[PDB]
Amino acid sequence: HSNILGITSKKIENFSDWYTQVIVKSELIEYYDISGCYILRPAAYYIWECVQAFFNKEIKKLNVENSYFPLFVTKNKLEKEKNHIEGFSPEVAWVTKYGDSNLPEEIAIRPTSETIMYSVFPKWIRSYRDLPLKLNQWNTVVRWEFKQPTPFIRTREFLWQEGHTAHKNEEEAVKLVFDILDLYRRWYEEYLAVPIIKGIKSEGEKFGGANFTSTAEAFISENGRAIQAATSHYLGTNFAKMFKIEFEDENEVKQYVHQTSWGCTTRSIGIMIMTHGDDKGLVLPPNVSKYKVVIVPIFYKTTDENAIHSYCKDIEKILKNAQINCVYDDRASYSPGYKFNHWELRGIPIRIEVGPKDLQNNSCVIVRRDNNEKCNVKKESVLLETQQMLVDIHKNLFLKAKKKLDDSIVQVTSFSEVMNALNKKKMVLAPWCEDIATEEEIKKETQRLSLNTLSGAMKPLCIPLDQPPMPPNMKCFWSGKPAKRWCLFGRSY
Amino acid sequence: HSNILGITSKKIENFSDWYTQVIVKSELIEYYDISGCYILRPAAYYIWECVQAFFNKEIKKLNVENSYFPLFVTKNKLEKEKNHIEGFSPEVAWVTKYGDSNLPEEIAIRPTSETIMYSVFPKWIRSYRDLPLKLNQWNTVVRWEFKQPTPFIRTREFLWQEGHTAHKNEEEAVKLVFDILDLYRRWYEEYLAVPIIKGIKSEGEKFGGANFTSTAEAFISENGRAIQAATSHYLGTNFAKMFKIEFEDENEVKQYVHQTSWGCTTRSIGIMIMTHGDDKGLVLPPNVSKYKVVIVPIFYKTTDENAIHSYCKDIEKILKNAQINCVYDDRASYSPGYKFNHWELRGIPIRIEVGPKDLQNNSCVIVRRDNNEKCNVKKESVLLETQQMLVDIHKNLFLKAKKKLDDSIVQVTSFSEVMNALNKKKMVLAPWCEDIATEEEIKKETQRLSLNTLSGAMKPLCIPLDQPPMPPNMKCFWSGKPAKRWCLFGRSY
Ligand SMILES: Nc1ncnc2cc(-c3cccc(S(=O)(=O)NC(=O)[C@@H]4CCCN4)c3)sc12
Ligand SMILES: Nc1ncnc2cc(-c3cccc(S(=O)(=O)NC(=O)[C@@H]4CCCN4)c3)sc12
Ligand SMILES: [Cl-]
Ligand SMILES: [Cl-]
Ligand SMILES: [Cl-]
Ligand SMILES: [Cl-]
Ligand SMILES: [Cl-]
Ligand SMILES: [Cl-]
Ligand SMILES: [Cl-]
Ligand SMILES: [Cl-]
Ligand SMILES: [Cl-]
Ligand SMILES: [Cl-]
């Protein structure tokens, strides 16, 4: 990796290389011997801890309790269900030995914990007094996917949380499915300044055993690829029937539980980086940056040295007293411009420059990372203006990313309008009959039309919860049948 | 598992079965298809989260930053070092396939992350400005150990934290080694009410590449087996030489870094259960129990029902207003005695009984879990007395466990005195010359003397930091040579 000090690929001209440079030169990640596995350095894992604390706070209000189930799973429990999502079998890593000894029975590594947890649920669930059962895990899962691996986005091994619940009836379960989905929206908006779109995945793309799969969909405008930001399934009684999870209800009749399972991944970090990063490097919402402010001294005269270091330490004291973490870069070995690029690259939201002009005027210079706008601030008002500026940066990052998302969403009706939008790097909202047979024809056929890596087919992303009005005689864009609902389409990571 | 409602094995008469009953009937764990892997239910994982928050708070003060490295490791990096602790090779689980496809290169699952992290350290460490480097992981590791598996104590898969640091010189590193060790002591004392003994492991039992291995040693008096509660290694330059971790110092001379690595495990939970549990089931320090108080109504007259439920809800309001979580068990389906045993079994520190006698006297009955002592408390003073009683329970649990630890420590000098103590289930402090050749002779030979599961040999546990005075002509108990220091010996889990 060359030119460690700066980003030499513009986000638009070469988005792929720009992303690799940002995550490495900002010290978020490091690559690894094993393809698809990545080292989350402290800067990246700080982001994970912030969203982890937030999500834990909110799911505790729903009485979800954390837990930990084994990393390994027997070939019996896992492969016991070929009616659920058994498309993980080609991706399931198998341990076959310890040392030079071979295992008697092979054991797999969890791609997800549905079979591990739900094999014990019948023991914990005997009557309606035992429901609802609400569990969550903060763990690591493994999926061996031949598809091109992308840091944070499609990885062989990723940290996540997987919640699983079971309920007395349908109404209780589905309300939790969407309550979690809104927590995912806050996960992205409040802490990552990333807008998403709530929807319902088509029958073709839904989770294996799910009744339906709700999703939060993000979009990378620069390369026109949607990403499944987070997921919340209503499994209904499907999984309850497979694993014989039954309960005596209030009227002595035995019933199947209604289950959910929801998960969000370090993929949120990748989406955040792609949404806000620019050619100077990493851009962070203040809520996920360890250092909210960096104080850079700027002078040349040896006489000013003593006065300036004290003035900067005054600012460091004001901020840290107000619980605003910050770094005072007083390294004399590096030029002021080196410090500028170094901390812009690391994504520090705010830079406070202090120079001789500042001492006499009793002020400072404050520079927003998102737009590089500078302003003079009297020393007394530094604390308040810094607080309001961290808020304004977050408000600005979200609204800019929302403008880019909406500019990428185009509403069309005909097949030809759809392809023009598709090859212009847009996410297309079109009327669709939702017949499942049309999903594979649409994907396979659009790929043959998009002449000139990642999959080039146009999948159905999600059917938005927010439905624009459907005209009376509107026809599906592909089949010509009467159209049921508007659906989002596009290429995907 | 029979008699789910109570513990049918006395902790002394059958300690092994008593432990299995406690951890399952108190809903801490559930057994699993794969030997050595255990399900940490919410009650057990709440304990993990409390100590996890505490340890994270304190290591952040030392500027240790959390991170996450890959679960997998190549056969090259792992086996590159046969001079370090390569005794993990027989315990290293190997993935050899994904799906029906075989992997080109086999990949292992981390038993520990020394090789994973230290293969990247040279990239992050170029000069003295880059030191100290302080990293930590909250992750899961795997060791396939044929030894008899015990929940929380010796498991195939366990949660832990592994810190790793690198320093400019020896003084900086070793100070951190012992600073972490004291954090482990607070981990056990402050939050688990478990006393431990700081020591230095013998040269025979030290960690693979360590210069020395400091340890915190706990002791299960009932079955007379010591356990390695926590560990903190000074690796010195040993690992720096293996992985070529060098740095340009302040005087332009390249040097090797001085490293440490420290870890503590869910084994702390197992030690806590064994130390405080009694025949009624689980006994918890208040700091690791979700519910500090359980309010049980006790009446028979239908007339009293309305008044009593309001009186109990008043107490629930007082406690929860003071941030003292509690459960008001108003289930009319279960007898009051059922509730008593149910919540004593789950380890709730305090039970507040409310009956008709309480309403007229405007008081309540408070029952300590640790000693079942009951006392009347006027309703007004419930909040204060409850707070002081949670503190007194913790003070009592620690001091009781410390009395049992010290009664199990016996100081002897001759070989025959040592064996009498050994077969009386004691941890023996004896003078020892520390010659390494004597470690395998002592272990192998004491096993042949202890006539009539787990290893029956007497290992050297640790050489305490607190050294009682050594007489002038004191001779090692085994060799007759002049004795260097007092060392602890005993059987181990
Ligand atoms: N390969 C990857 N690389 C990087 N980041 C990610 C994120 C991924 C993902 C995230 C959420 C949900 C799903 S899911 O639809 O498979 N549902 C499940 O697993 C269910 C629900 C949780 C319990 N099991 C997948 S996969 C992946
Ligand atoms: N098999 C088991 N079952 C249940 N609980 C436990 C706990 C165990 C343990 C705890 C602390 C330290 C050690 S260590 O001495 O091996 N040192 C290392 O790994 C170093 C230091 C951290 C980074 N690598 C082992 S092993 C084990
Ligand atoms: Cl590969
Ligand atoms: Cl809101
Ligand atoms: Cl996906
Ligand atoms: Cl410079
Ligand atoms: Cl603004
Ligand atoms: Cl086995
Ligand atoms: Cl103290
Ligand atoms: Cl050990
Ligand atoms: Cl009963
Ligand atoms: Cl007391």
Check pocket membership of A158 for ligand 1, CB cut-off 6 A: yes
Omega before residue A471 within 30° of 0, cis:
no
The answer to whether B438 touches B203, Cβ cutoff 8 Å, is: no
- The residues facing A256 across adjacent strands are A246
Q: What is the residue type of A213?
A: T
- For testing contact with chain B, the best of A67, A252, A333 (most B CBs within 10 A): A67
Alpha-carbon distance A33 to nearest alpha carbon in chain B (angstroms): 7
φ and ψ of B476, to 5 deg: -45, 140
Q: Would you say A129 is a known binding-site residue? A: no
Residues listed for chain B: 493
Q: With an 8 Å Cβ cutoff, are A74 and B34 in contact?
A: yes
3-class SS letters over A35-86 = CCCCEECHHHHHHHHHHHHHHHHHHHHCCCEEEECCCEEEHHHHHCCCCCCC
Residue ranges of chain A that CATH labels 3.40.50.800: 286-391
The answer to whether B137 touches B161, Cβ cutoff 8 Å, is: yes
CA of B35 relative to ligand 8 center, distance in Å: 5
The answer to whether A328 touches A312, Cβ cutoff 8 Å, is: yes
- For testing contact with chain A, the best of B5, B34, B113, B325 (most A CBs within 10 A): B34
φ and ψ of A434, to 5 deg: 70, 5
* A48-56, Cβ contacts within 8 angstroms, sequence gap of 24 or more: A48/A159, A48/A266, A48/A269, A48/B68, A49/B66, A50/A191, A50/A287, A50/A288, A51/A187, A51/A191, A51/A192, A51/A268, A51/A288, A52/A138, A52/A161, A54/A186, A54/A187, A54/A190, A54/A191, A55/A161, A55/A183, A55/A187, A55/A264
Distance CA B476, CA A467 (A): 84
- The residues facing A234 across adjacent strands are A212, A260
Residue for token pair 């389409």: A489
CA of B98 relative to ligand 3 center, distance in Å: 11
Nearest CA, atom 7, ligand 1: A265
Q: With an 8 Å Cβ cutoff, are A67 and B157 in contact?
A: no
Which residue in the set B33, B70, B142 is minimally distant from A34, CB to CB?
B70
Ligand number, closest to the Cα atom of B189: 9
Distance CA B202, CA B434 (A): 7
Distance CA A166, CA A87 (A): 24
The answer to whether B168 touches B247, Cβ cutoff 8 Å, is: yes
CA nearest B99 in A: which residue?
A90
CA of A304 relative to ligand 6 center, distance in Å: 20
Nearest CA, atom 4, ligand 1: A154
Residue for token pair 């012992």: B178
Q: What is the residue type of B86?
A: E
B62 CB neighbour count, 10 Å cutoff: 16
Question: Looking at ligand 2, which atom is closest to the CA of residue B266?
Answer: 5
The answer to whether A274 touches A245, Cβ cutoff 8 Å, is: no
The answer to whether A79 touches A86, Cβ cutoff 8 Å, is: yes
Cβ-count burial of B433 within 10 angstroms (0-12 exposed, 13-18 middle, 19+ buried)?
Answer: middle
A463 CB neighbour count, 10 Å cutoff: 22
Residue for token pair 């006027």: B378
Ligand number, closest to the Cα atom of B368: 12
CA of B454 relative to ligand 10 center, distance in Å: 13
CA of A454 relative to ligand 3 center, distance in Å: 16
* A135 contact residues in B (CB cutoff 8 A): 42
Residue ranges of chain A that CATH labels 3.30.930.10: 4-285
Cβ-count burial of A184 within 10 angstroms (0-12 exposed, 13-18 middle, 19+ buried)?
Answer: buried
Dihedral in degrees, nearest 10, Cα atoms A423, A429, A435, A437: 10
The answer to whether B262 touches B213, Cβ cutoff 8 Å, is: no
Which residue in the set A45, A95, A123 is minimally distant from B95, CB to CB?
A95
Q: With an 8 Å Cβ cutoff, are B93 and A93 in contact?
A: no
Q: Which of A114, A231, A266 to mutate for ligand 1's pocket (most ligand atoms within 8 Å of CB)?
A: A231
Omega before residue A336 within 30° of 0, cis:
no
Pairing of strands B157-167, B133-142: antiparallel
Distance CA B54, CA B439 (A): 37
Give how far Cα B250 sits from Cα of B123, B127, B128, B171, B274, Å. Answer: 19, 8, 6, 16, 51
Give how far Cα B160 sits from Cα of B52, B194, B203, B264, Å. Answer: 9, 18, 25, 6
Residue A189 half-sphere exposure toward CB, CA atoms < 13 A: 14
Alpha-carbon distance B468 to nearest alpha carbon in chain A (angstroms): 43
Distance CA A156, CA A160 (A): 13
Q: With an 8 Å Cβ cutoff, are B70 and A157 in contact?
A: yes
What the block records as the tokens of B44 is 């057990």
Residue ranges of chain B that CATH labels 3.30.110.30: 409-492
Distance CA B277, CA B23 (A): 10
Distance CA B70, CA B13 (A): 45
| N-terminal to C-terminal alpha carbon distance within chain A | 24
The answer to whether B483 touches B432, Cβ cutoff 8 Å, is: yes
Pairing of strands B197-200, A427-432: unpaired
Q: Would you say A156 is a known binding-site residue? A: yes
Check pocket membership of A143 for ligand 1, CB cut-off 6 A: yes
Q: What is the residue type of B324?
A: I
φ and ψ of A483, to 5 deg: -85, 135
Q: With an 8 Å Cβ cutoff, are B76 and A33 in contact?
A: yes
Q: Which of A115, A265, A492 to mutate for ligand 1's pocket (most ligand atoms within 8 Å of CB)?
A: A265
Distance CA B172, CA B131 (A): 11
Q: What is the residue type of B68?
A: Y
The answer to whether B82 touches B208, Cβ cutoff 8 Å, is: no
Which residue in the set B89, B97, B139 is minimally distant from A94, CB to CB?
B97
> What resolution (Å)?
2.4
Pocket lining for ligand 2, CB < 6 angstroms: B 112, 114, 143, 145, 154-155, 158, 162, 207, 231, 233, 261-263, 265, 267
| N-terminal to C-terminal alpha carbon distance within chain B | 24
Give the full edge-to-edge strand order of the sheet including B72-74: A72-74, A101-109, A93-98, B93-98, B101-109, B72-74
Distance CA A331, CA B381 (A): 58
Please, what sign has the CA dihedral across residues A331, A333, A339, A341?
negative
Which residue in the set A48, A70, A96 is minimally distant from B34, CB to CB?
A70
Does CATH number 3.30.110.30 belong to domain B409-492? Answer: yes
Q: With an 8 Å Cβ cutoff, are B67 and A41 in contact?
A: yes
What the block records as the tokens of B82 is 């046969």
Question: Looking at ligand 1, which atom is closest to the CA of residue A265?
Answer: 7
CA of A107 relative to ligand 8 center, distance in Å: 11
Distance CA A202, CA A432 (A): 11
Distance CA A118, CA A153 (A): 28
The answer to whether B84 touches B114, Cβ cutoff 8 Å, is: yes
The answer to whether B488 touches B428, Cβ cutoff 8 Å, is: yes
The answer to whether A394 touches A355, Cβ cutoff 8 Å, is: no
* B334-339, Cβ contacts within 8 angstroms, sequence gap of 24 or more: B336/B296, B336/B297, B336/B298, B338/B5, B339/B294, B339/B296
Q: With an 8 Å Cβ cutoff, are B40 and A96 in contact?
A: no
3-class SS letters over chain A = CCCCCCCCCCCCCCHHHHHHHHHHHCCCEECCCCCCCCEECHHHHHHHHHHHHHHHHHHHHCCCEEEECCCEEEHHHHHCCCCCCCCCCCCCEEEEEECCEEEEEEEEECCCCHHHHHCCHHHHCCEHHHCCEEEEEEEEEECCCCCCCECCCECCEEEEEEEEEEECCHHHHHHHHHHHHHHHHHHHHHHHCCCCEEEECCCCCCCCCCCEEEEEEEEECCCCEEEEEEEEEEEECHHHHHHCCEEECCCCCEEECEEEEEEEECHHHHHHHHHHCECCECCCCHHHCCCCEEEEECCCCHHHHHHHHHHHHHHHHHHHHCCCCEEECCCCCCCHHHHHHHHHHCCCCEEEEECHHHHHHCEEEEEECCCCCEEEEEHHHHHHHHHHHHHHHHHHHHHHHHHHHHHHEEECCCHHHHHHHHCCCCEEEEEECCCCHHHHHHHHHHHHHCCCCCCCCCEEEEEECCCCCCCCCCECCCCCCECCEEEEEEEEC
List Cβ neighbours of A307 (8 Å cut-off, separation of 6 or more).
A359
Q: What is the residue type of B178?
A: F
φ and ψ of A105, to 5 deg: -110, 130
Among residues A140, A213, A272, A97, the alpha carbon closest in space to that of A460 is found at A213
Q: With an 8 Å Cβ cutoff, are A74 and B33 in contact?
A: yes
The answer to whether A109 touches B34, Cβ cutoff 8 Å, is: no
Give how far Cα B62 sits from Cα of A10, A44, A247, A362, B234, Å. Answer: 39, 20, 50, 35, 16
Ligand number, closest to the Cα atom of A338: 6
List Cβ neighbours of B60 (8 Å cut-off, separation of 6 or more).
none
Residues listed for chain A: 493
Among residues B52, B54, B104, B50, the alpha carbon closest in space to that of B74 is found at B104
Check pocket membership of A386 for ligand 1, CB cut-off 6 A: no
CA nearest B98 in A: which residue?
A93
φ and ψ of B436, to 5 deg: -70, -30
Cβ-count burial of B445 within 10 angstroms (0-12 exposed, 13-18 middle, 19+ buried)?
Answer: middle
CA of B336 relative to ligand 11 center, distance in Å: 8
CA nearest B63 in A: which residue?
A42
3-class SS letters over chain B = CCCCCCCCCCCCCCHHHHHHHHHHHCCCEECCCCCCCCEECHHHHHHHHHHHHHHHHHHHHCCCEEEECCCEEEHHHHHCCCCCCCCCCCCCEEEEEECCEEEEEEEEECCCCHHHHHCCHHHHCCEHHHCCEEEEEEEEEECCCCCCCECCCECCEEEEEEEEEEECCHHHHHHHHHHHHHHHHHHHHHHHCCCCEEEECCCCCCCCCCCEEEEEEEEECCCCEEEEEEEEEEEECHHHHHHCCEEECCCCCEEECEEEEEEEECHHHHHHHHHHCECCECCCCHHHCCCCEEEEECCCCHHHHHHHHHHHHHHHHHHHHCCCCEEECCCCCCCHHHHHHHHHHCCCCEEEEECHHHHHHCEEEEEECCCCCEEEEEHHHHHHHHHHHHHHHHHHHHHHHHHHHHHHEEECCCHHHHHHHHCCCCEEEEEECCCCHHHHHHHHHHHHHCCCCCCCCCEEEEEECCCCCCCCCCECCCCCCECCEEEEEEEEC
**Radius of gyration over every alpha carbon of chain B, rounded to an integer in angstroms:** 26
Name the CATH code of domain A4-285 (choices 3.40.50.150, 3.30.310.40, 3.30.930.10, 3.40.50.300): 3.30.930.10
Q: Would you say B145 is a known binding-site residue? A: yes
Using N-to-C axis directions, what is the helix angle for B15-25 and B267-276, rounded to 10°? 110
Chain A to chain B, count of Cβ pairs less than 8 Å apart? 137
Distance CA A19, CA A155 (A): 15
Name the CATH code of domain A286-391 (choices 3.40.50.720, 3.10.450.200, 3.40.190.290, 3.40.50.800): 3.40.50.800
Distance CA A156, CA A32 (A): 12
Give how far Cα B397 sits from Cα of B271, B275, B279, B394, Å. Answer: 13, 9, 15, 5
Distance CA A450, CA A372 (A): 39
Largest CA distance in chain B: 87
Pairing of strands B133-142, B65-67: parallel
Planar angle of CA B124, B125, B131, nearest 5 degrees: 115
Alpha-carbon distance B209 to nearest alpha carbon in chain A (angstroms): 20
Distance CA A461, CA B404 (A): 63
